[PDB]
């Protein structure tokens, strides 16, 4: 069968990506209906309340919005929503898909449309970490790149890229302009809480390991209460019930409490016998994705 970390097809999203430039600053925008969303730092490197004042002094014609077809979209209004700039255009994107702005929770996995100059050059999966960051791949010019997925014919937009933190960590806002992890769009030092391995995804992965075929599967159970008590002190998110996990448990006939025990045991010492070829927990394969591939 095989288990992979899938990315959502990008046809729908590609039609909404546009180029946005202001006083030499160029990055990517999201074009839905008659609105264009992009990072407010396209205005320059400011802080605190400066943003609003800067935008007040700006002119709508200073904003250069260009589609992938080469069409320039005149801006008729501008406003700030959190750290996101929203520019209204006179022309609407006739190819706007059904969509929804959703905030990603820790462990949620989605697709990043890595974009440069208003064009999507590639895609890859990411998972919202417990500290509000994602481990992605972005270079200068990638700001404004969006994170999304597609469920039941709707495009869910979870993220817009804004900055890189030390140790190749990335963060940004949801499409409402709110920063994940409470970070800010300023080039100053920022504290990043420790990254906690995502238990629910690890469980999903262990179920995948079971299905694909174990000597590593612990025979004893540990209560969810005790594991969670333990997790809070060992860098692991709490285990939380989920339908996909219950179905995986049903498919294999293996109680999740045994996978939780397996996590505690191998967290202390893995030794060897590898699980699916590795000696470290896979944290970004979700219960839903694993179930979908069964």
């Amino acid at each position: 069968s095989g288990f992979k970390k899938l990315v959502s097809p990008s046809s729908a999203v590609e039609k909404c990506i546009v180029s946005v430039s202001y006083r030499g600053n160029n990055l990517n925008g999201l074009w839905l209906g008659d609105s264009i969303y992009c990072p407010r730092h396209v205005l320059g490197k400011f802080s605190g309340d400066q943003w609003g004042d800067v935008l007040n002094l700006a002119n709508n014609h200073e904003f250069e919005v260009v589609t992938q077809n080469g069409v320039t979209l005149n801006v008729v209004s501008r406003r700030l929503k959190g750290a996101v700039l929203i520019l209204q255009t006179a022309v609407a994107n006739a190819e706007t898909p059904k969509y929804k702005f959703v905030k990603a929770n820790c462990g949620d996995s989605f697709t990043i449309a890595c974009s440069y100059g208003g064009t999507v050059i590639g895609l890859y999966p990411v998972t919202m970490r417990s500290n509000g960051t994602i481990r992605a791949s972005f270079l200068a010019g990638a700001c404004g790149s969006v994170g999304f997925n597609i469920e039941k014919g709707v495009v869910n937009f979870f993220y817009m890229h804004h900055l890189e933190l030390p140790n190749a960590l990335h963060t940004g806002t949801d499409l409402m302009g709110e920063f994940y992890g409470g970070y800010v769009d300023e080039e100053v030092a920022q504290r990043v809480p420790p990254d906690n391995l995502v238990t629910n995804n690890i469980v999903a992965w262990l179920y995948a390991a079971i299905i694909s075929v174990p000597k590593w599967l612990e025979s004893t159970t540990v209560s969810i209460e005790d594991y969670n008590r333990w997790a809070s002190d060992n860098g692991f998110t709490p285990f939380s019930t989920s339908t996909a996990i219950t179905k995986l448990s049903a498919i294999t006939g293996v109680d999740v409490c045994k996978l939780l025990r397996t996590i505690m045991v191998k967290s202390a010492q893995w030794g060897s016998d590898p699980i699916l070829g590795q000696y470290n927990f896979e944290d970004e394969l979700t219960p839903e994705s694993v179930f979908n591939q069964v």
Binding site: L27, P39, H41, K45, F138, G141, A142, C143, G144, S145, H161, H162, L163, E164, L165, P166, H170, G172, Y183, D185, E186, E187, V188, A189, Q190
Partner: peptide, 5 residues
């Protein structure tokens, strides 16, 4: 420490 894309 942070870098704006």
């Amino acid at each position: 420490x942070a870098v704006l894309x």
